[PDB]
Amino acid sequence: AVKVKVXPTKVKV
Amino acid sequence: AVKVKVXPTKVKV
Amino acid sequence: AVKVKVXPTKVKV
Amino acid sequence: AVKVKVXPTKVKV
Amino acid sequence: AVKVKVXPTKVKV
Amino acid sequence: AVKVKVXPTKVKV
Amino acid sequence: AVKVKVXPTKVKV
Amino acid sequence: AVKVKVXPTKVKV
Amino acid sequence: AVKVKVXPTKVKV
Amino acid sequence: AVKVKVXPTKVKV
Amino acid sequence: AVKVKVXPTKVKV
Amino acid sequence: AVKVKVXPTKVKV
Numbered sequence: 001a002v003k004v005k006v007x008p009t010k011v012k013v
Numbered sequence: 014a015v016k017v018k019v020x021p022t023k024v025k026v
Numbered sequence: 027a028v029k030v031k032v033x034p035t036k037v038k039v
Numbered sequence: 040a041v042k043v044k045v046x047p048t049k050v051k052v
Numbered sequence: 053a054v055k056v057k058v059x060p061t062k063v064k065v
Numbered sequence: 066a067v068k069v070k071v072x073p074t075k076v077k078v
Numbered sequence: 079a080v081k082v083k084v085x086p087t088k089v090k091v
Numbered sequence: 092a093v094k095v096k097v098x099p100t101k102v103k104v
Numbered sequence: 105a106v107k108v109k110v111x112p113t114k115v116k117v
Numbered sequence: 118a119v120k121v122k123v124x125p126t127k128v129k130v
Numbered sequence: 131a132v133k134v135k136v137x138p139t140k141v142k143v
Numbered sequence: 144a145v146k147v148k149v150x151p152t153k154v155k156v
Contacts (some may be wrong), residue, residue: 001068002093003105005116006020007019011037012070013026014094016027018038024115026078026094028054029040030078031051033071038072042079044090045059050076052056052065055066057077063089092133097111102128103135104108104117106132109119109129120144122155123137130134130143141154 003012016025029038043052055064067078079091092103107116118128133142146155 001024002069004017004024004117005105006017006037007022009018009019009035009037010037010038011017013015013017013039013067014096015039018027022113022115024110024113026093026117028052028078030076031076032069032070033074034067035071036051039047039067039069040061040090041065043058043065044079045061048059048076050058052054052078057066057079058089061087061089062077063087064075092135093117095110095115095117096109097113100111100126101140102108102110104106104130104132106130114129116127119143119156121134121136121141121143122144123139126137128134128136130133136154139152139154141152143156 001012066078
């Protein structure tokens with residue numbers, strides 16, 4: 001899985 | 014890989 | 027894709 | 040979307 | 053509805 | 066389905 | 079929300 | 092590294 | 105992780 | 118970060 | 131710096 | 144940005 005930030009939200013997918 | 018959406022902002026990771 | 031809350035974080039996956 | 044709880048772990052789907 | 057795993061339990065919600 | 070993680074919290078959608 | 083059991087699987091929805 | 096796709100544009104990061 | 109712009113979309117991967 | 122270009126494909130990293 | 135693929139071309143930027 | 148070439152690989156950075 002990979003860490004991402006999209007808009008203001010960080011998350012790992 | 015999957016579509017990630019945060020309000021109006023999308024991207025596929 | 028579905029709206030989800032993981033921990034305190036809302037996102038659409 | 041609905042609250043889902045398994046043991047102590049709650050989330051929203 | 054979407055296939056989920058929450059904790060150790062898989063289910064469709 | 067993909068594991069979505071926020072720090073040490075983990076689920077699968 | 080309520081606890082549901084089907085055979086071996088429980089979950090609260 | 093992971094595939095990223097935005098609309099029809101794919102790349103790898 | 106690195107800030108990227110793919111097509112029109114800025115994100116961090 | 119910098120524009121990287123390969124023929125007519127541009128991005129920024 | 132990060133390994134990237136821009137168009138068909140791999141490189142590290 | 145400038146055209147750069149190493150062996151077979153050209154790119155513009």
